[PDB]
From Swiss-Prot, chain C:
GO terms for biological process: cellular response to dexamethasone stimulus; chromatin remodeling; DNA damage response; heterochromatin formation; negative regulation of DNA-templated transcription; rhythmic process. The lineage of its organism: Eukaryota, Metazoa, Chordata, Craniata, Vertebrata. This is Chromobox protein homolog 3. One of its GO terms (cellular component) is chromatin. Keywords: Acetylation, Biological rhythms, Chromatin regulator, Isopeptide bond, Nucleus, Phosphoprotein, Repeat, Repressor, Transcription, Transcription regulation, Ubl conjugation. Residues 8-63 form the Chromo domain. The chain holds residues 114 to 176 of 183 of the full protein.
């Protein structure tokens, strides 16, 4: 039964992935929280730790991204602001810094310029 | 204090506003222009007049409802 | 017979809600105490400075 422990691990991974896919789909209706301009490129197809498989975005340096929310320390949710690009998982600045530390050894400017912004806020009831 | 044309003086078409700030005392927009990755600041009052639907699309994108804050 | 069909001039947007599925403005009309609800898309086209004034009033740095 050294492989029933691995089915337990898989079931845990699957539940986590299902919840991530829900939060991703539900982000589509949230407002844009803020924009960033990128100072680095990133290829989500080559990333392996993505909360949902095949949903990491890609972008070039000097692109603009729209961020809907932060998922965890390594991932945000949003989209490349270009026609046809859809919402997905976005590597956090920390993740990009750690990729850069690896790309460095084996083969300082922050990876995103965050654009702070005012937003129109309509007050609702205290619920 | 620069001399290159800035903002709407660059003669480019507006694409999208990417932020709004009144830190200077007057409301300004950070404007992305079509076919340029170089965004710069324009006065909101001017953009309200020149490209009101661009202004509105930004506000609709960022519009948020909050409870007693 | 409602909204812009009443033939009144827009005065001020009082509120906004998307709780129905589409963004609606609560519109105050000049010389009428009876507001009604109009689609944002329609106000955007017919009184954009009124829409912009509503959002500008609401802009803020902190929730
Ligand atoms: Ca490259
Ligand atoms: Ca698109
Ligand atoms: Ca300013
Ligand atoms: Ca309302």
């Amino acid at each position: 039964s050294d492989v029933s422990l691995e089915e337990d691990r898989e079931a845990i991974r699957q539940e986590r992935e299902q919840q991530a896919a829900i939060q991703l789909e539900r982000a589509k209706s949230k407002p844009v929280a803020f924009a960033v301009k990128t100072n680095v490129s990133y290829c989500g197809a080559l990333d392996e730790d993505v909360p949902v498989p095949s949903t990491a975005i890609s972008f070039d340096a000097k692109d603009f991204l729209h961020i809907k929310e932060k998922y965890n320390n390594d991932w945000w949710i949003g989209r490349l602001v270009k026609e046809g690009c859809e919402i997905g998982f976005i590597p956090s600045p920390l993740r990009l810094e750690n990729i850069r530390i690896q790309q460095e050894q084996k083969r300082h400017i922050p990876p995103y310029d965050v654009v702070p912004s005012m937003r129109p806020v309509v007050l609702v009831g205290p619920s | 204090a620069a001399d290159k044309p800035r903002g709407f003086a660059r003669g480019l078409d507006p694409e999208r506003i990417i932020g709004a700030t009144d830190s200077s005392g007057e409301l300004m927009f950070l404007m992305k222009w079509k076919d340029s990755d170089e965004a710069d600041l324009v006065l909101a009052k001017e953009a309200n007049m020149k490209c009101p639907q661009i202004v509105i699309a930004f506000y609709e994108e960022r519009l948020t409802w909050h409870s007693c804050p």
